[PDB]
Design a protein around this nucleic acid. Structure first.
Ligand SMILES: [Zn+2]
Ligand SMILES: [Zn+2]
Lengths: 249, 1120
DNA sequence: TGTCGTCAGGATTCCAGGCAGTTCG
DNA sequence: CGAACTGCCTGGAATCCTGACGACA
């Protein structure tokens, strides 16, 4: 139960947990000898967020025993609003339900909070054949989704051999973006067959606005199977969103 | 005595305030030159100010004070009809005035029903059958809640004036009775819920019995099946007349037969018919006979059944019966400990004991005071008892309410004890107070008790509770019943189960202690596994729990709580046996030389407009005068303009600010183009030769408030304003002006206001039997300089904790009301220093300075304002009142709270022109102040004073004999959004579950709310009435035309789907927690309705959404 | 006459990219 | 002699208390 994690500057982790809170409120961080893990489902059982951070991310990391703790997303969002980019985040926990967040600098800050428990059921996602993989930049996808957000909500991604297309249909508007290997927004392609699927972009737009511009993304999808967008944190941690498309035309 | 001098000082201060107001109004900056709110001399003055005539006060006083109010009013109406003081018009006007005066006299002049609610009364003839008569009673708005008593009295006076005029009996036609019963059933089924469900035969008998027909007015736009009925001008619904007749005859039978016996008129035996129709409903122990009497008493069962009309039904606690305590008091109150540990009207009583519950630790404890209540108000496990709330006997309850079974109380117990010792040892004493030295000394010598202890016991038996040892010691001499406060509730157990209780007690550990030849005990240690703990916990006894004692569940009961259970059993000496038709107390009294009694037997159960500035559509929706001045737009209003004889300026203001005089009012014909002053209007008989229309002072024209605002700006001289809007519609007939300077001052003060025209703020009070300076926050020297020199018993005032009688002119008023009154006084002093330059009379600038002045209270349906003095305050969000300041007409008047106001506020901002022409709100207007309520000064002063803290031993002994509660002789002898609501409902369900030990069923009001919600939702969806956003008046048709042709924007629609979407989870959680039938169909129907109205478009490979609805649907599918 | 939902609306603070001042081969 | 690296600061936008509306009992 007791642990201590010290890191000089955690604005990335702050905005990450802010996006997780905007996604869902009930979340439990499992602390194991390897690091931290979290898996948040959806109240409408349509979206799944997963994150893992090993012990090669923060500066100081001392854990006693692997367990599962819970932190309120509202109480955390009421905490990250004071995180300076040049601060030293220190998360301390003992045996009692007291969580300490410490910051060292021009004034020693220390906030104590109660620790409630979360009992969300965890189940391993079954393996599914992707048949479509691609690695792109985050800024291009973010600006495309922000340009196609106001016209409609169903954005259609089509992928063929060395070809990608992001389109936005409708009745009084149409948007189209082409992507090839010699373009300025595609890093690499691993397409297998001709796939095409339309997805909603509310949670998409929120989660891609929460992520910075220089970060990269890896999309895995198929014909009509759910999409998985993954990315890496400091080349050590992993974070993946997963959500199914719509059946309509 | 000195109360007359105090009232003289009060009226002297009132006259000083009146002289100040007169000196202020002497300048004449408002269209009014006389006092609008005069003080009433008596009921004669009240009725004269209500309807008059102005000068019949002498005859009214003579007749009343010489022959009684009833025949006095009868002869007064006779004289008014005969025209003794002269003539006043036609016979119809005579009848109208007589009816109004009679009703005002019998109602004491408090109700404005005959004033405005009943506008006109005419006589009309039947041109169809035989030429009989009907009263055309042109009613008005404020008559929908005229009151059942007032409606019955109006029917009585109408029949009386009909008998006086000598009219013919109307013939009830088939079409007439058909449309009457149709309107009745329509109002009962669709319009509004009724207070008394009528019957077809009953309403037919009534409509046939009424000699002359009655024709009311229009209420709503609801048609009938038989169109064009002869007699009525339309085919609308006469719901007003329906409710009038219903609450008049079908509800007020008791007062009706009382007034019948008072008057003596024939033709009313159908009320006796209705009484008859409602009248169509060796092994013998004393407690069994009492149970048989309670079973024969149908009133408690009928009340428990009728209590199902409100609140969640079928949620009664099985441990404790559905009733509170009965404390007989002259003429409800529940201990706030139960409210803190937690549905009807509430009333606080903190000076009594509380309930007893168990905590999370497993032990059982009772609630005593506020600190312990707030401490244990969160660690409760299950509610055992409800406490001991007080219901009295002086309540005016009718409809054959049977006698509630009383209880053996400590006061009655000690009274019987002292009477027994007086008749045995020949010792005189005075109970209910401190005893004399010699008497208390001889009593202490006879009873082996302390004299000071006996004094304290006689002073307060509940506070000074004797120890159980000495209690049993003194009981062994007289064989008196047991101590009630330390007597458990045993009236719900079987002797076969009591035998197992005595077996478990014998199989337990016991230690003894005796005191003064009383072989009592010292402690009992029991194991919770030795017997069924159901009744062991339902007994409601404070025990201590222990776990680490080699045994899982151990309980221990020490003194003075173990002797209270062991000594009634005789220290387990004699053997207990089970006997039917004999309660446990009966068996105990059988197998013992001491007879006991019973304890628990009583079971009874928008828009927020601020200023008056007519702008209409010229203001749009917000109607901001600052916005209008910035835009520089005109305004087409139907308003009254003025004209100055010297300057000549025209404007809707009262006084001309350019010059130093007040401008007069000009008259204009709206149809023609002529203008004439008041002199020409009164000379031309108020008729224009151009247009033959009555000369109206106001006209419809355009004005520019943008440039007209500079006048008010330079008049107020203060430009501190942030947000301020004007009125939109005018309800008055003349549509007179309003002081713009006073409106701007009110805006800068940032206070609220109603549509009445003055400043009044709501407050809630509740009278109590006593009064304490410690609680009201006033010092002894403060009361002395106020005028109090002695206590309720003649002793001087030196102690702050001096229990006193409830003073009449005292106010227990909350801090919010105090702050609002402070802001009102600030605005008042600001206006009186900026309007005329008058010195501040009150000079109030702090919270404590307001104590001493005079305010006015007013309830709905009360056209008279009760003048009270500001003596007191309050810390809690509620307050207390006086039984004279709060009467029955102020309690059952469609409102429990009352509005408070200041005298200067009324004197400065009151104007009859602020009253609508035909309709009216909850009240007409605070026309007249009243302060004299002399409660039999020279006749029954002892009756008025001696009301508190008396216990009738006679009725306490004669309560288990099925006495008649309507015994007037014995009565006189003894007298002599969503979050808060959802959380509250869930917490109420949870606490009910804790109390009933996790055993409940479904409710019915949830469906009674959902089904009408679903139907209304469907009707709104099929109607789809839209409204243009900026075009606020033009309602767009459901046929969509793209956009509003006058406003190229969106059109606001009435979706009404967000409420049901939030109510669905409530029913879902309810049906998931408890399983019930007859409603899964409704649940699946509403869910599928939402689904196919939207027609859940995305689904993953792993679904399995848990839903009890889908579970039950699949179960029914498999069963099919 | 009490309650409950929706909508827009303008005033507010928070975030981000352009204008400007500044130390590096 | 030019290029990143900040401040900062002001535009753009998300949030929200207030002001309209309708629904039931
Ligand atoms: Zn003038
Ligand atoms: Zn005219």
């Amino acid at each position: 139960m007791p642990f201590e994690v010290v890191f000089d500057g955690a604005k990335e982790f702050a905005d990450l947990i802010a996006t997780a809170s905007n996604l869902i409120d009930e979340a439990a961080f499992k602390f194991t000898e390897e690091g931290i893990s979290m898996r948040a489902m959806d109240p409408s059982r349509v979206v799944l967020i997963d994150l893992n951070l090993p012990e090669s991310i923060f500066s100081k990391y001392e854990v006693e025993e692997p367990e599962t703790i819970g932190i309120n997303m509202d109480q955390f969002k009421k905490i990250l609003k004071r995180g300076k980019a040049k601060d030293t985040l220190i998360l301390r926990k003992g045996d009692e339900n007291f969580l300490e967040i410490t910051f060292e600098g021009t004034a020693k800050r220390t906030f104590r909070l109660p620790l409630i428990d979360v009992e969300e059921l965890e189940l391993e996602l079954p393996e599914l054949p992707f048949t479509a993989k691609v690695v792109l930049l985050g800024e291009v996808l973010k600006e495309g989704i922000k340009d196609a957000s106001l016209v409609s909500d169903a954005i259609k991604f089509i992928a063929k051999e060395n070809e990608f297309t992001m389109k936005a249909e409708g009745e009084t508007n149409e948007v189209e973006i082409r992507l090839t290997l010699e373009d300025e927004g595609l890093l690499d392609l691993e397409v297998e067959e001709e796939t095409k699927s339309a997805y909603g972009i509310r949670y998409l737009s929120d989660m891609v606005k929460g992520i910075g511009k220089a970060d990269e993304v890896i999309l895995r999808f198929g014909n009509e199977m759910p999409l998985q967008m993954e990315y890496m944190i400091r080349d050590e941690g992993r974070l993946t969103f997963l959500l199914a498309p719509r059946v309509e035309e | 005595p000195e109360m007359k001098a105090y009232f003289e000082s009060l009226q002297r201060e009132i006259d000083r305030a009146y002289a100040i107001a007169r000196k202020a109004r002497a300048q004449g900056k408002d269209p009014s030159f006389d006092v609008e709110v005069p003080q009433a001399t008596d009921m004669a003055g009240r009725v004269e100010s209500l309807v008059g005539p102005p000068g019949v006060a002498e005859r009214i006083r003579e007749l009343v004070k010489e022959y009684g109010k009833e025949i006095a009013a009868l002869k007064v109406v006779d004289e008014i009809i005969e025209g003794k003081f002269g003539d006043l018009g036609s016979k119809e006007k005579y009848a109208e005035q007589a009816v109004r005066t009679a009703l005002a006299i019998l109602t004491e002049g408090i109700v404005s029903a005959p004033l405005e609610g009943i506008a006109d009364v005419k006589i009309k003839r039947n041109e169809w059958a035989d030429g009989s008569e009907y009263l055309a009673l042109y009613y008005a708005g404020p008559i929908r809640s005229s009151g059942g008593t007032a409606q019955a009295l109006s029917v009585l006076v109408g029949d009386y004036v009909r008998r006086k005029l000598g009219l013919d009996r109307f013939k009830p036609s088939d079409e007439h009775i058909e449309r009457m019963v149709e309107e009745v059933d329509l109002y009962h089924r669709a319009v509004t819920r009724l207070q008394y469900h009528p019957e077809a035969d009953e309403v037919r008998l009534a409509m046939r019995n009424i000699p002359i027909e009655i024709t009311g007015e229009e209420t709503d736009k609801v048609e009938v099946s038989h169109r064009n009925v002869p007699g009525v001008e339309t085919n609308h619904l006469r719901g007003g007349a329906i409710l009038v007749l219903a609450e008049g005859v079908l509800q007020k039978a008791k007062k009706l037969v009382k007034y019948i016996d008072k008057m003596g008129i024939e033709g009313w035996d159908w009320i006796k018919e209705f009484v008859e129709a409602k009248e169509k409903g060796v092994e013998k122990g004393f407690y069994y006979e009492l149970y048989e009497k309670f079973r024969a008493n149908i009133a408690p069962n009928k009340k428990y059944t009728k209590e199902i009309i409100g609140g969640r039904p079928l949620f009664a606690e099985p441990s404790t019966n559905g009733g509170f305590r009965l404390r007989y008091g002259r003429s409800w109150s529940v201990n706030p400990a139960t409210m803190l540990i937690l549905g009807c009207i509430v009333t606080p009583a903190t000076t009594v004991e509380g309930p007893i519950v168990r905590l999370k630790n497993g032990s059982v404890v009772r609630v005593d005071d506020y600190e312990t209540a707030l401490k244990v108000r969160n660690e409760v496990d299950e509610i055992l008892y409800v406490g001991d709330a007080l219901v009295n006997f002086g309540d005016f309850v009718e409809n054959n309410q049977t006698l509630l079974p009383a209880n053996y109380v400590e006061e009655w117990w000690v009274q019987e004890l002292v009477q027994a010792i007086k008749d045995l040892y020949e010792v005189e004493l005075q109970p209910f107070a401190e005893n004399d030295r010699e008497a208390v000394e001889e009593a202490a010598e006879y009873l082996e008790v302390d004299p000071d202890f006996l004094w304290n016991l006689l002073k307060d038996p509940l506070r000074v509770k004797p120890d159980v040892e000495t209690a049993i010691h003194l009981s062994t001499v007289l064989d008196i019943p047991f101590h009630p406060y330390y007597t458990l509730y045993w009236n719900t157990l079987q002797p076969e189960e009591v035998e197992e209780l005595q077996k478990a007690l014998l199989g337990a550990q016991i230690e003894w202690a005796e005191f003064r030849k009383n072989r009592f005990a010292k402690k009992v240690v029991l194991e919770n596994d030795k017997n069924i703990k159901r009744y062991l916990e339902l007994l409601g006894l404070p025990h201590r729990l222990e776990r680490v004692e080699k045994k899982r569940k151990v309980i221990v009961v020490e003194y003075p709580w173990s002797a209270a259970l062991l000594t009634p059993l005789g220290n387990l000496e004699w053997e207990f046996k089970a006997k039917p038709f004999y309660t446990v107390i009966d068996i105990i009294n059988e197998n013992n030389r001491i007879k006991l009694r019973d304890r628990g037997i009583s079971w009874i159960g928008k828009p927020p407009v601020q200023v008056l500035f007519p702008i209409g559509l010229a203001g749009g929706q917000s109607r901001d005068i600052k916005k209008a001045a910035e835009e520089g737009k005109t305004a087409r209003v139907e308003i009254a303009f003025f004209k100055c004889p010297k300057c000549g300026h025209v404007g809707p203001e009262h006084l001309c600010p350019v010059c130093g005089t007040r401008k007069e009012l000009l008259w204009h014909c709206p149809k023609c183009g002529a203008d004439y002053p008041e002199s020409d209007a009164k000379d031309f008989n108020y008729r224009c030769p151009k247009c033959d229309v009555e000369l109206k002072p106001y006209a419809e024209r355009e004005i520019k408030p943008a440039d007209l605002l500079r006048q008010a700006m330079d008049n107020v001289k203060v430009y501190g304003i942030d947000r301020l809007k004007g009125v939109k519609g005018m309800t008055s007939g003349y549509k007179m002006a309003e002081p713009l300077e006073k409106g701007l001052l009110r805006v800068k003060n940032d206070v609220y206001v109603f549509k009445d025209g003055t400043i009044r703020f709501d407050a809630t009070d509740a009278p109590i039997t006593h009064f304490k300076p410690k609680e009201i926050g006033t010092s002894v020297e403060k009361l002395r300089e106020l005028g109090y020199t002695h206590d309720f018993e003649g002793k001087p005032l030196e102690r702050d904790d001096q229990i006193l009688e409830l003073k009449v002119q005292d106010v227990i008023l909350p801090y919010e009301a105090g702050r609002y009154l402070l802001k009102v006084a600030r605005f008042i002093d600001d206006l009186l220093e900026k309007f005329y330059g008058l010195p501040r009379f009150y000079n109030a600038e702090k919270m404590e300075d307001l104590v001493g002045h005079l305010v006015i209270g007013l309830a709905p349906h009360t056209s008279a304002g009760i003048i009270g003095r500001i003596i007191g305050f309050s810390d809690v969000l509620v307050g207390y009142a006086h039984p004279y300041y709060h009467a029955a007409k102020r309690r059952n008047c469609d409102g429990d709270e009352d509005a408070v106001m200041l005298l200067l506020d009324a004197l400065l901002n009151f104007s009859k022109y602020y009253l609508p022409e035909k309709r009216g709100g909850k009240m007409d207007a605070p026309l007249v102040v009243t302060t004299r309520l002399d409660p039999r000064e020279v006749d029954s002063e002892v009756h008025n004073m001696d009301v508190v803290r008396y216990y009738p031993l006679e009725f306490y002994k004669a309560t288990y004999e099925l006495k008649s509660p309507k015994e007037v002789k014995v009565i006189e002898r003894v007298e002599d959004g969503d979050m808060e609501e959802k959380v509250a409902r869930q917490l109420a369900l949870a606490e009910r579950i804790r109390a009933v030990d996790e055993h409940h069923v479904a409710e019915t009001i949830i469906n009674s709310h959902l089904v009408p919600d679903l139907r209304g939702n469907l009707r709104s969806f099929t109607r789809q009435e839209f409204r243009c956003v900026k075009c606020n008046t033009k309602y767009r048709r459901p046929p969509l035309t793209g956009k509003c042709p006058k406003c190229g924007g969106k059109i606001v629609l009435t979706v009404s789907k967000g409420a049901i979407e939030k109510y669905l989870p409530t029913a879902k959680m309810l049906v998931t927690k408890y399983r019930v039938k007859d409603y899964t169909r409704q649940r699946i129907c509403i869910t599928e309705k939402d689904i196919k109205t939207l027609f859940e478009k995305q689904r993953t490979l792993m679904g399995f959404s848990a839903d009890i609805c889908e579970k039950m649907v699949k179960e029914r599918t498999g069963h099919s």
